[PDB]
From a paper:
Schistosomiasis is the name of a severely debilitating disease caused by parasites of the genus Schistosoma, among which Schistosoma mansoni is the most prevalent species in the world and is estimated to infect approximately 200 million people. The parasite shows a complete dependence on preformed purines for its metabolic needs owing to an absence of the enzymes which comprise the ‘de novo’ pathway for purine biosynthesis. One key component of this pathway is the enzyme purine nucleoside phosphorylase (PNP), which catalyzes the reversible phosphorolysis of the N-ribosidic bond of 6-oxopurine deoxynucleosides and nucleosides yielding their correspondent base and ribose-1-phosphate. Crystal structures of several PNPs have been described which can be assigned to two main categories: the low-molecular-mass homotrimeric PNPs which bind to 6-oxopurines, and high-molecular-mass homohexameric PNPs that accept either 6-oxo or 6-aminopurine (such as adenosine) as substrates.
Aiming at shedding some further light on these questions we report for the first time the crystal structure of a binary complex between PNP and R1P alone. The asymmetric unit of the structure of SmPNP in complex with R1P (SmPNP–R1P) contains the full PNP trimer (6347 protein atoms) along with 368 water molecules, three molecules of R1P and three molecules of acetate. One possibility is the time used during the soaking experiment, which was much longer than that reported previously (48 h compared with a maximum of 2 h used for bovine PNP). The ligand presents an intricate hydrogen-bonding network involving either ten direct and four water-mediated hydrogen bonds (subunit A) or nine direct and five water-mediated hydrogen bonds (sub­units B and C). These interactions are limited to the well defined phosphate and ribose binding sites which are lined by residues S35, R86, H88, Y90, A118, Y202, M221, S222 and H259. The base binding site is occupied by one acetate molecule which interacts with E203 as described in previous SmPNP structures. c electron density map, as is frequently the case in other SmPNP structures. This suggests that the binding of R1P is not sufficient in itself to cause the loop rearrangement observed in complexes with the nucleosides inosine and adenosine. Even in subunits A and C, where the loop is well ordered, significant differences compared with the SmPNP–inosine structure can be seen. This is most notable for the interaction between O5′ of the ribose and H259 Nδ1, which is weaker in the SmPNP–R1P complex (3.4 Å and 3.07 Å in subunits A and C, respectively, compared with 2.73 Å and 2.62 Å in the SmPNP–inosine complex). The SmPNP–R1P complex is the first structure in which we observe a unique conformation for this loop suggesting that the anionic moiety may need to be covalently bound to the ribose in order to fully favour all interactions made by this loop.
Residue numbers in the entry:
A (entry chain C): 3 to 287
B (entry chain B): 4 to 61, 63 to 253, 267 to 287
C (entry chain A): 4 to 62, 66 to 287
Write the structure that this text describes.
């Protein structure tokens, strides 16, 4: 279970991190599969390997520790999680919750998150951006909600509302920023459903998910968003459609993480630009 | 906690039987903000969970109580302090109290909860008698019964036919109508959201389209255990919120306690 | 329980290889009341799970049965591992990965399922052509945890999980042997169980596009697919799902077993005739 994402352990982590950077992040960023470029476009960046943060959850790419990247992006102080924690890997809820709660204590007000997702909605094209305006947390509706277990009152209430989980204003900004910069056509809003994974969704599953009103499906993001909303961090989340969900069993096309990565590699640049440009126009600061 | 097997349950029940001579025929579980009923129990014996060895324990200030006594002439055991899965309680922990009830002699379990209203015909404060449920966690491999079956209590694969006893439902409705609040009472399908997050509009829309009428984070697990060991079940949701479907878009507590008393009043007796 | 990693799976496969010379190319898993196939295995060696170190235990003890079925080398799991029993992912995964290491190329699985699809009759066979892994979607996918690279990829696709050629072959065999009318193809949804499905659940599952519902199969199929074993799977419809909450009709396990046992011989025949027509090099 790693370390309990309670106030004491989170504070310890936050304070260790604070000793390692003068950057007080206003904006937290989680990069999805193949969506790292943004990470590297951080200016005046301090890079802190997860291995170098005591009690911070560990995730390697393959042997390599993920990184916490502090710096600025469009003149805003950010912390970027380079390497997220997917539940299908077996990570505990505390493992996934901790980094977000650390972000909260560090000063993060807005969490921006990307993921690679399958396009269920038939109108989606590979490489489309689907801003999450809502989600369906299949694991959470089951008994696998990241918040299951004693509530950490320090961070939030027992029964978080997920009413405006995907801040409608952030979404409006994101869309406008896409519109103004010539790629509004790539931008949709929709419902992301979490498949715990790690299997890609069968055609029957995709068909069911689509009929449930899901637009994109992936294996991440919702738990982080839940933790985020729980502790009052505003969320903006986008899915890169990295595969068009196959709805027919009588089909050649088979999802594969490689093509997901390829699609991510191809759209990483535009998504980075989009993110930098959204960040530039974030209010309150 | 401790496996809700016949031996561990037998022990907790035997302890309790040393603490009271009330043999309940009716078990009552009150939901969120309900349970203004535990007050109206006559000649009650309040037994704090803390006092019972191996009994699951509730949650600052308000520790749990097993309230024994009489309601509308009938012997009851009320659970003041309910155990929700989102709290991280084990299957055994949630099953044990229900099986203890069984050993203590409970024949009918009456359950109330606070639920979100999915069905668009529902209004705040409506009562939705459960006539069926969708056990999302159960289908998704978090069925309270997962693990070695405790054969002493019930069969490996319990059917959930008539799980919400139709006769009890008929009676509950008749009593509501006879008491001038029949118009508040609906019947419908309760779906369990493991929680503890409230349901997103997308989730509610999906739940509605799944044929769900109300959603909450309790009840089904207890009901499963009750049905498993042959306890008849009556269960009702107080609609305490009307679910929002699109992102782009005390009074009752005592009425319910009254309703329960009046139902119990009319419950058949051997 | 031991991790279904390559080391543990090898150890088991080797210990089994010390007890039998039969290199199985076909793995068979029998469902509720359907183990009549285990009897038809010729030149057979029966290896109680108990006789296998670190092999999952289930019950009399379960058996790995090695031998010949329609001239093809098979290994049959007499006694499978159901998640509703409390078994770990590793417990379910390991036997399938052991089969992989023993040389299994095709996994044929049966199960007893509730018939959701309203055109299904009791005792029908519904060949699985796809599945809805409700536990899987809900974060109880058997593969959750470190990926075992020796066996498979981190994110297995499940597109042709129910090998369409095996399905075609299964249907032709049924058709030519007089019981094609018994045979359907459909979507199996896993109810984690062990409760039978409520009428509202059944109604929901049906509307989700599910034809049959059971509490097994998907996890082994997923592990099989993950390690590149080809899968054929069939639900025996051992009960017609009750969608009506006012109905007196209800599932009864004794009836489920009876219905399965009644059909086991035909199913055995079918599996044998399928295996007989499997292409061989
Ligand atoms: O969600 P992200 O991290 O982007 O990654 C997604 O893509 C991967 C498989 O394609 C899974 O990890 C899924 O969750
Ligand atoms: O179901 P009861 O016990 O009514 O409580 C319900 O209300 C709480 C949330 O408002 C959750 O615990 C939910 O299950
Ligand atoms: O799937 P098989 O193994 O056939 O068995 C099924 O039959 C039982 C339910 O009747 C459960 O065990 C279910 O999994």
């Amino acid at each position: 279970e790693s370390v309990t994402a309670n106030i004491e352990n989170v504070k310890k982590v936050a304070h260790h991190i604070q000793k390692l950077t003068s950057i007080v992040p206003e904006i937290g960023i989680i990069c999805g599969s193949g969506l790292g470029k943004l990470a590297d476009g951080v200016k005046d960046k301090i890079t802190i390997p997860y291995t170098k943060i005591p009690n911070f959850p560990q995730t390697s790419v393959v042997g390599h520790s993920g990184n916490l990247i502090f710096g600025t992006l469009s003149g805003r102080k950010v912390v970027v999680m380079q390497g997220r924690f997917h539940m299908y890997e077996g990570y505990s809820n505390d493992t996934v919750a901790l980094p977000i709660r650390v972000m909260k204590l560090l000063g993060v007000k807005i969490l921006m998150v990307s993921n690679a997702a399958g396009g269920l909605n038939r109108s989606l094209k590979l490489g489309d951006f689907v801003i999450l305006k809502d989600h369906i947390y299949l694991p959470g509706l089951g008994l696998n909600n990241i918040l299951v277990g004693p509530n950490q009152e320090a961070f939030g209430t027992r029964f978080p509302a997920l009413s405006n989980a995907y801040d409608r204003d952030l979404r409006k900004l994101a869309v406008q920023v896409a519109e103004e910069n010539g790629f509004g056509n790539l931008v949709h809003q929709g419902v992301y459903v979490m498949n715990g994974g790690p299997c890609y969704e069968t055609p029957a599953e995709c068909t069911m998910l689509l009929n449930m009103g899901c637009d994109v499906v992936g294996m991440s993001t919702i738990p982080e968003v839940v933790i985020a909303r729980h502790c009052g961090i505003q969320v903006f989340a986008v899915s890169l459609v990295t595969n068009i969900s196959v709805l027919d069993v009588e089909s050649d096309l088979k999802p594969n993480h490689e093509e997901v990565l390829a699609t991510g590699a191809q759209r990483a640049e535009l998504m980075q630009s989009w993110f930098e440009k959204i960040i530039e126009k974030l209010p309150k600061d």
